[PDB]
């Protein structure tokens, strides 16, 4: 049961690609099952490092009304290649799974377009971030993968 | 859309249009064919 | 931050731009290029030759006629009574049922436009050797109804503006129609598929024989005289409408007569399938409510109709659905059930007085779609 | 009225304007005041004597350390080992639940920010006589992690950066904690409510006791230090997070445990109240369809549970209700049954498997709604 | 306030910007930074040394053929014939289902783009001391399809252009080849997954033994000669289209045959559940009409089929429903009913000839849902 | 057509201008004008002789106080001790339920305004002839709250700022009250209708009686003073709120107590009609699921109510209906039944234990609405 609060999504945001999630063995997602990967990563899987910001262009369904909320949160370190992907959250244990007050956040209004569109900045405290896939050696590496890690919430 | 809402897009119709921007340059001059008239093409008798 | 507090805007929402306009009117639109000042360019062998213009299609000849000059024609006998518009007609004599036509340039570019003005011209070639002599009237009357078309000849036409020419050695000659009408432009002569607004030509040429001809005894006796037509120096035409003519890349065309009977617009591909309130019914799609609905058939009073498709490949597949009974739900429109005789007997019911309600799921099966929209033939018997 | 027939813009809406922006932006809004260009102003004496600016905040000193140094310390007694960031900590020994703390400025200023750098000032006010003499190391140990903060000595302290001070008539000292990290900057020590993304000092400052004090027979052996933290200047924060810290205006904190039993979210208020498709059930709502919707119970299998609140006062009171059966309705929600040794009957025929249907609105009344969302207990018996 | 009574604009709404457009537009956005005009930064160690760049990335050899040249290689034998495109292929003998490639840079910066043209440039690295003396042809036919690919020898290809190398001393040179072909460009060898639009090569380069390796006895019979490719001087792309080569950094892929069964796209998840206008049915939500739906299964005249599931540990938990009946509901779409043999005697019922409403909740308990869309084995019985 | 293929504009919509701004902006408009620069126009006799502005109606005397100042009145007699606020109140004796009140004109313009500041002007026109001699403080004591607004005398005044006038020949003069407060501004005194924010004055204007009236024997006794208020020089109002005052165009007031009983907002007129889920029943609209919904009546417990019409000619009339019973119809609302006694009776089987559905149209007619929402008395019965 989710609360005005609950972030309905989650996703680190890096132009690496997310780990590609094909799908489930009975329904798979088959652009990432059949296009594999894309441009982006096919490109960014030629360079060692980077240093720059991402754009987003969030597209929601339009059979929904309500009003959405965005945050970017730069505080969130990757903690592996493993779930380097699109979390659905569940239940709040921390402050993780809700709206939370200093970051930068936007709310799309549904009704009148449903589309937001961003600009994720380069907020790390690195001088560029790892750019293949991250195994996590070291513990401070990890904060220098994704530029931050953006929620999705409905209210 | 999901197969939840693809009920509501069966046998609607989707209608397109075109016009050649600005760029087109049609080449060689070739003859036309035969035509046929419109205005002779039968009615539909009740 | 500045706060602006100005009062903003207030406009118009309108949901497309323009499909009229086409000329002093810079577009906005979505590319699919990656560059947003790119446009398509034309190198060195890639350039525009033929720069696409009505005065550059309509001032080319193409042939329209064929004409048989022989010597038995005497010095009166017509040989083209042909309109004086750029719709000169030659017909193909072909064995599909709608017949094809050749134009002239003129006439394809004059046939998408309403109205046309200006001096037609016909060149002539009389395929003659140099020992072949005669002479004919090219002439041109401004105004003659479908009723004055007949009592005709050349001696009416030299009343007109009239050509003679003088066939002894040069053998070809361009007459330029004159443009003379009350009218500034003229409005086109076939139209859209609309039998009103057909407006025959505003005059009509004529070529007759004033001296015939003299042949040598070496020198066959007959010529053929060759009409091309071209659109003058002062031929132009204004107002883009629908086309008159069509192409010959696909001369199928499809009668809808009302005699046979099918699925209504938008009902169809359709299966048989369960429905909660109505056994089978041939729905449309698998949302709720969406029965494919059917139209009324023209039952007289006494007697009754089933159904039974022309053809049971294109029919829904279950056993191929090849009977089914017309009748209202009484949700304001009609269903089509599928029957198993069966259909005679429900007709015997349903025409008779009864109801669908009265006493009088297992072959769903696949659930085949029907053959887009097949037709249908109605049985029709006594009751 | 000349037409104006060019070809319009083409944008993109969106509802808001920028939540995140706020520097070099002209924001559109809707004043309500009365003046388009009026804006408060600030007269001579509602002047703004402090600029609010992270350079002015940081730069303040704030007490966060109570030091006790006796004369029995040795010469290497250690007297705080406290964290070279600008989260130095002072507990209160209070009796709340939740415990409050004293930040310096720094700190507080420092806690809305991802990141930070730059030195530190530690204020050393060494409150003594003249007649005290004393010596103390003030140093810093460029990374240390918490399995290295022990074993440590004065000694090793010198390898690093130190500052010895002689406590001889000046009394107070300014020891400029260096930044040295392998990092521009350096994240937050806390975060909000998540325990990952917390990560430790850069570095430690300690302080040791290099000689011993020495009071004279006529002042007393022991002697407090405090020790105030200031962003020095080179100290500066980038990244606006979600601050780390909360007020104590209301340190009031609800721990939502499973284990308690309520109405799901946006379903309370509730009322006893009729309703169509099912007898009173509990609805938050006057319209049609708006019962108010409840979780299903843990009920392990062979047993069964009814419900009881914990406060008869926040109940819906039609008698008060404070019983209930929560069972599945069939439109896929859980609806609350109430009841009147009913409830446990009930729950004996719905979970032993029985219906709703089967055979096994005058208490209406008032329709008062229940106090918010109340806490339902829930009881649980053998079936 | 004056009143502005002029007309107002006229426009075009559009949900979207351009996500094709990458150039000469600024694109307008909602920033989740603080200062509006504010851009990321690279100070002079975080400085960008590659330019990302097509001619820099193709302009850097990779390493594509490993060629054994011995001894006893006669003077006309093949080393590799090779195509003369971007795509020149290194296949890893591995273990995967699918075949991991290798490829030079100018091959996956060409795989981007539907189109090339240009020279390539292959570095022939003749590993060899400077006791080691031979001559080899590396020739290029313009022109080869695959089935003139064979009857090839190096005399037919010293009357194309060929290139012969001295092995003396110098033991590495560079053929350019040549960009011949009819086309100013050249579409791509693979393309998406798509088995059309996958176009050869303009030509095929060869590399034969022209004169035969005359080694000392001191040095060894057999020499390695690494072939790398580089993206020439004249090199170049132009549309960018889908790639056709993916990462090796998820190798997993689902192949969609249709002969196991599943839910529909959008009705999974899904738990046990109980539903008013049908006893439990899986639903994939809470609110009413959220059945989950399931395709008809091909069952031949005269059979039946029941279900059961491949995993018991993804199915709905109440026991976890690993049996289930999938049938019309009447509504449209087909219902998984679950059951306890009573699966068989139900399909027994239902393909017999009967229905749901024919006489022949408290098993719901947890709701979970299913670990996704579970993958459900039909099993098949005779009526 | 030039494509414009920059990106567009990314704006937010709003549904309406401000309605609080009115000065320094351009309001666009839909004007119902011809002329789209047309403005209304002020003649030469059409022309505006007044500039509505605060500080030119409120430098208008308005009259507020009549004073009766005899002969016998003490050498400390009070003659006014109104407050020195723009709210002086002069109270009509009139016989109507809410009391009508004379202000001046600073005083209705200031009741539109929260705050104001600045000097008051009284001016008291002592009517005398010039044989009248007396002598009178005005004076003026800054913050005078109403526990100390007692205990006063004349020589409290005199140690505040007062005015001592001589009556002897000139019969007239204005004692500008002092603003003194605390505060810049002062809020006004009365507000909208609420009892908060009801602050009163600053300070109060006294007026005693110096030196007695010594008439001479042929002159009268007794004097009238006028006192008449302006806004001073200085005076100034500020903040736009709700005016504190209304007009006397219309002074009739609906108390809304709620002990007496009607439909609910929104369900206003009503009439008699039939309805397919409940027999007439009060139907709002023509439209199905149109009931016209009602309170629930607080009911004790034990007891009944049916309901009688206070006028029947306000009733809805199919017979003019004036009876009717008020009960659940199990939608979530409360409808009411419209009877014949027999309301009584179907009160004793609903608030017995009864149901709708126990077995415990014509009458429908013109189906007059009923006169607005017409008020119904709650008769009340034991059970
Ligand atoms: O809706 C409107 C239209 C014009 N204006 C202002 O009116 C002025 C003239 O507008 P036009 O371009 O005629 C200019 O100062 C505009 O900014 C508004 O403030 N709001
Ligand atoms: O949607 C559009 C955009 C621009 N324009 C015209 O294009 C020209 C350049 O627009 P921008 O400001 O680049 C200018 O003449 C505009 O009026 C349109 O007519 N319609
Ligand atoms: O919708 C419109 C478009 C233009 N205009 C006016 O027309 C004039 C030319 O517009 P453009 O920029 O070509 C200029 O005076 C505009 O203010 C309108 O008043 N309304
Ligand atoms: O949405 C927008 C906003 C500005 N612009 C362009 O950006 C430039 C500056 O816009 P402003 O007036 O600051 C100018 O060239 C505009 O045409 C766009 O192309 N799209």
Known sequence: DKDIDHCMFTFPCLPQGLALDIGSAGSPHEIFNRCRDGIIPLIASGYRFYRGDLRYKIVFPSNVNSNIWVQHRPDRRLEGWSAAKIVNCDAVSTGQGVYNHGYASHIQITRVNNVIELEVPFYNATCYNYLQAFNASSAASSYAVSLGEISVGFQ | ATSDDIASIVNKPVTIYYSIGDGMQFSQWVGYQPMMILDQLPAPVV | ?383
């Open chain 3, 1 to 383: 931050n500045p706060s602006y507090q100005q009062s903003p805007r207030h406009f118009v929402p309108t949901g497309m731009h323009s499909l009229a306009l086409g000329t002093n009117l810079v577009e906005p639109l979505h590319a699919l290029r990656l560059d947003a000042a790119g446009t398509t360019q034309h190198p060195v062998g890639c350039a525009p030759d033929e720069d696409m213009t009505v005065s550059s299609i309509a001032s080319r000849y193409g042939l329209i006629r064929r004409v048989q000059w022989k010597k038995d024609h005497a010095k009166g006998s017509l040989l083209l009574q042909l309109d004086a518009d750029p719709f000169v007609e030659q017909r193909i004599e072909g064995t599909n049922p709608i017949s094809l036509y050749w134009f002239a340039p003129v006439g394809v570019v004059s046939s998408m436009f309403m109205q046309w003005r200006g001096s037609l011209e016909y060149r002539f070639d009389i395929i003659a050797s140099q020992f072949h002599t005669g002479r004919l009237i090219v002439g041109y009357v401004p105004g003659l109804t479908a009723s004055l078309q007949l009592q005709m000849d050349y001696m009416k036409l030299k009343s007109s503006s009239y050509v003679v020419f003088d066939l002894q050695e040069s053998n070809s000659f361009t007459f330029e129609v004159p443009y003379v009408s009350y009218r500034p432009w003229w409005v086109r002569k076939y139209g859209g598929n609309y039998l009103p607004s057909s407006t025959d030509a505003p005059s009509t040429l004529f070529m007759y024989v004033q001296v015939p001809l003299i042949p040598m005894e070496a020198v066959s006796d007959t010529i053929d005289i060759n009409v091309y037509v071209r659109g003058g120096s002062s031929f132009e035409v204004c107002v883009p409408v629908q086309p008159s003519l069509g192409l010959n890349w696909n001369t199928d065309f499809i009668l809808r007569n009302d005699e046979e009977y099918r699925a209504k617009t938008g009902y169809a591909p359709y299966y048989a399938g369960v429905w909660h309130s109505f056994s089978l019914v041939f729905r449309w799609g698998s949302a709720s409510d969406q029965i494919a609905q059917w139209p009324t058939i023209s039952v007289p009073r006494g007697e009754l109709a089933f159904l039974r498709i022309k053809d049971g490949k294109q029919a829904a597949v279950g056993q191929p659905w090849r009977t089914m009974v017309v009748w209202p739900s009484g949700h304001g429109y009609n269903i089509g059930i599928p029957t198993y005789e069966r259909a005679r007997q429900l007709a015997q019911h349903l025409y008779g007085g009864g109801s669908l309600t009265d006493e009088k799921a297992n072959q769903q099966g696949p659930g085949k779609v029907s053959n887009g929209n097949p037709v249908w033939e109605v049985m029709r018997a006594p009751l």
